[PDB]
């Protein structure tokens, strides 16, 4: 069986989501070959962790997980195992012992607008840290100085979520970079994808 794995919707990726809704998917039992994933457009980051890109296909695994979302262009270097940042504590994060691959590249042609595509938002406040691979759907008002406001979101109490613009007429750091995260596991059944 050398049939195509459904990677088309992963890459061309009709539309996307936000950071907290980091769009978990599940696919398995296909034929994996990343020659399609080879360089085709100007790519700004292909520095992925613990694995040789050459030997991705010869040695194959089970239970592959691949997700994507949007991120501000300046922080793209901040997603690392054991790396600090507000995204690590208040948004989707990654544990230290990470084995998988990752890609980054700017998307200015379709994600730009005369004012900015304000659809994409992010979370700025939580109580404490987050465990790896968790989706937070909290909506209650976050307190700042005790005395909870009970939905007022006024002085001394701030709403946990915020958003930022995507105006094309900016610098490099403000350009929206589409990023895809690759993860997997070893498990104990016969392999599922490679070939």
């Amino acid at each position, epitope marked *: 069986i050398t049939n195509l794995c459904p990677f088309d919707e992963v890459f061309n990726a009709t539309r996307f989501a*936000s950071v907290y809704a980091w769009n978990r998917k599940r696919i398995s039992n296909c034929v994996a070959d990343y020659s399609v994933l080879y360089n085709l457009a100007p790519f700004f980051t292909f520095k992925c962790y613990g694995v040789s890109p050459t030997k991705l296909n010869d040695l194959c695994f089970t239970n592959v997980y691949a997700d994507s979302f949007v991120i501000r262009g300046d922080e793209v270097r901040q997603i690392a195992p054991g790396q600090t940042g507000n995204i690590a504590d208040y948004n989707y994060k990654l544990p230290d012992d990470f084995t998988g691959c990752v890609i980054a590249w700017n998307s200015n042609k379709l994600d730009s607008k005369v*004012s900015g595509n*304000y*659809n*994409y*938002l992010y979370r700025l406040f939580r109580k404490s840290n987050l465990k790896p691979f968790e989706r937070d759907i909290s909506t209650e008002i976050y307190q700042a100085g005790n005395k909870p406001c009970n939905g007022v979101a*006024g002085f001394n109490c701030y*709403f946990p979520l*915020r*958003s930022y613009s995507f105006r094309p007429t900016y610098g490099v750091g403000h350009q929206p970079y589409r990023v895809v995260v690759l993860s997997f596991e070893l498990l104990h059944a016969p392999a599922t994808v490679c070939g």
Partner: antibody
Amino acid sequence: QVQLVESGGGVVQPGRSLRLSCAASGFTLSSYGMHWVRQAPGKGLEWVAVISYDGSNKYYVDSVKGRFTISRDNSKNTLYLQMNSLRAEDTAVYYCARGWAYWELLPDYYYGMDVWGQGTTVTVSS
Amino acid sequence: QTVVTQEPSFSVSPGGTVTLTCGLSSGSVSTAYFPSWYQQTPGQAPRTLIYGTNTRSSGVPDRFSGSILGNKAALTITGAQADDESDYYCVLYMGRGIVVFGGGTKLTVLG
């Protein structure tokens, strides 16, 4: 393709349950969620209820906790607007809305009113 | 109460530019959640103008526009005409199952 037909309006004594329907044609309402709203005579319209992935959530206003319930019919492609034990506090020409999609962020119910009109009138009186 | 704001009425001559604003009693418009403004027709079915800052709708004339300007969300329309002589509703989404509307702002053209 996006046509809506509704029935079940009328006037009756308070304190008895009423059945009203928002039947849809041209697309499957069971595909994805929608909502609906009421408009008081003269006074400004205000929201009542929203539905979800057709199995996910049953969010209501704070004013109707413990007295309202919503229902759907996937096989016949309609949703039931069950109205139990009419109170004089509710009297409008409320009508159902449209929001189907499948690819978006979910911090809200989103996809507000987009197609309205040609609905049913419900009045409660003693 | 969570009821936000609604101006009583505003005045403008036709053929020019008209703005419209609905502030917040909480004063936090920076929430960046969907601001949506809706037409009204007294006695018949209203329709849509904007769903999300300035995200334009389908089948719409280009003269209408609007965005978060200043600290409080507003609107601005130019080349006004007698197409829609009625009030409008600005809607913000807060509450994870909670919806806020307004009483309407009775825009009246003077020509």
